[PDB]
């Protein structure tokens, strides 16, 4: 029974398969061919590396029948520890019900869920995991199925990837009043920090967009991390510009308190509708 198991294990790296237990080579075997059942119905080192995220397939009743191999690079837990176990056993209960109804039943899904992280910004273990917000976009497909890619939002105090011209940092109160802005934004959007300071972010969005920000803002707060959609902030002397911003909530590491919201703001467009003027400013 050990002989059969260890060449089952080693035709699933023989390094990692050398160490698998009974129950888990079972789960990995079972889920490998289950996944293959779905791929037949849909139809690498660089594909995998070139993702700021991992891919997961999750059933309508919640099982994780496949996760990205690079999973461990983002969340620490490797592919083999969590395959076949429930997603509900690794994400925030306050998010669970929302996860439930994303698994359920328009095909396209896009949301944020907090998982468990056991990789430090090296490695710690389950009793000391921290919750990590993941931006997930995918399809729900027919037994039902969820196919999402999950991107962690880079934390702006600890970044690995460079930033080009067309991005500008920003700090806000928790109600999103500008309480600090990048100096370049003037060249970008045409405001000095001076005017923006003490000003509600919400009197600079174009009106059709304000309702969609509220959701981004409440995601930001409830989860503390978020990516907005595209939206357009109104510009210096008329027109607007299009932005996408990663907004994360930063805490004082001393008094465990929310201190402010910092945002990286990718500018996606130059001024548009430059002639037209929208707001008093």
């Amino acid at each position: 029974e050990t002989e059969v198991f260890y060449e089952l294990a080693h035709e699933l790296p023989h390094s990692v398969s050398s160490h698998l237990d009974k129950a888990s080579i079972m789960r990995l075997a079972i889920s490998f061919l289950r996944t293959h059942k779905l791929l037949s119905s849909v139809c690498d080192n660089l594909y995998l590396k070139a993702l700021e995220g991992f891919i997961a397939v999750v059933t309508q009743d919640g099982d994780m029948i496949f996760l990205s191999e690079n999973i461990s690079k983002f969340m620490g837990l490797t592919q083999v520890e969590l395959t076949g176990h429930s997603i509900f056993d690794f994400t925030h209960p306050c998010d669970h019900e929302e996860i439930r109804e994303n698994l359920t039943l328009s095909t396209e899904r896009d949301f944020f869920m907090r998982m468990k992280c056991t990789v430090t910004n090296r490695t710690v273990n389950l009793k000391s995991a921290t919750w990590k917000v993941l931006h997930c976009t995918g399809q729900v497909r027919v037994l039902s199925c969820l196919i999402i890619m999950c991107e962690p939002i880079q934390h702006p105090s600890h970044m690995d990837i460079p930033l080009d011209s067309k991005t500008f940092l920003s700090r806000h109160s928790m109600d999103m009043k500008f309480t600090y802005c990048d100096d370049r934004i003037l060249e970008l959007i045409g405001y000095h920090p001076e005017e923006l300071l003490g000003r509600s972010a919400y009197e600079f969005y174009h009106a059709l967009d304000s309702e969609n920000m509220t959701k981004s803002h409440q995601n930001l707060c409830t989860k503390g991390q978020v990516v907005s959609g595209q939206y357009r902030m109104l510009a210096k002397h008329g027109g607007y510009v299009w932005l996408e911003t990663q907004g994360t909530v930063i805490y004082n590491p001393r008094n465990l308190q929310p201190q402010c919201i910092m945002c990286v703001n990718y500018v996606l467009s130059e001024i548009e509708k430059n002639d037209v003027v929208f707001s008093m400013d």
Partner: protein
């Protein structure tokens, strides 16, 4: 019980095993799993999840050294057509691009063909090959004029459709109160709803009044007003109005 449920599930999944008159044993069940995978995509998972595709460009000049075929499903272009990324991207993104040419990550709006652009989140890294970018671009999920007011009625925001709907360029309208443009007979009524939409915080009332045209013609108009609140403070920063001829 769960090892057995794995025994049974495995066998149900092995057609070679579950196409049999009986249920064999674990040594065997383990053995036929082994041969059944000794017998025997990621890009499909990618394109099925995010509508992403892979591509490989030279960093030095920005010309493509590989394109995944997912380009055709993702953005309707032929793999044969996909050259230089600068030609594929919106002109206003060349600059952005050039400083992205360690890992890399950005956004840019690229053309689709049959001039329409689609914004695409790009992710990848630089590998040596005089170097190359290895990236994955993924796609995303998604008569009247609308104005917006401070609590007192002063136009804080209007879209260009005001000139088509009331004939005033935004600027004439902005800064002034609405009741400045209302007909005398209707003005408290306008103010009434303003006195009301706030009292009924959250959701809409609608009110109708004669608005002043630029050629001075009083025009019947219907305005659907609701207060908009800060999701944090519950501060009523403004009330949003769509004013409809």
């Amino acid at each position: 019980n769960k090892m057995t449920a794995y025994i049974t599930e495995l066998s149900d999944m092995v057609p070679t095993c579950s196409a049999l008159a009986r249920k064999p044993d674990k040594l065997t069940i383990l053995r036929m799993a082994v041969s059944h995978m000794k017998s025997l995509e990621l890009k499909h998972l990618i394109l099925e999840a995010a509508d992403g595709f892979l591509f490989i460009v030279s960093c030095e000049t920005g010309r493509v050294v590989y394109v995944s075929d997912s380009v055709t499903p993702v953005l309707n272009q032929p793999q044969s057509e996909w050259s230089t990324l600068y030609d594929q991207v919106h002109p206003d993104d060349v600059d952005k691009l050039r400083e992205q040419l360690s890992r890399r990550s950005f956004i840019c709006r690229m053309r689709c063909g049959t001039p329409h652009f689609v914004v695409v989140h790009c992710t990848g890294y630089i590998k040596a090959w005089k170097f190359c970018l290895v990236a994955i671009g993924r796609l995303q999920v998604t008569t009247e004029f609308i104005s917006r007011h401070n609590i007192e009625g002063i136009f804080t925001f209007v879209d260009h459709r005001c000139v088509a709907t009331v004939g005033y360029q935004p600027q004439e309208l902005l800064g002034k109160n609405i009741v400045e443009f209302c007909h005398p007979e209707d003005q408290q009524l306008l103010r009434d709803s303003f006195q009301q939409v706030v009292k009924l915080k959250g959701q809409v009332l609608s009110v109708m009044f004669r608005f002043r045209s630029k050629t001075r013609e009083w025009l019947w108009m219907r305005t659907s007003s609701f207060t908009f609140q800060n999701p944090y403070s519950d501060e009523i920063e403004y009330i949003i109005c769509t004013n409809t001829n």
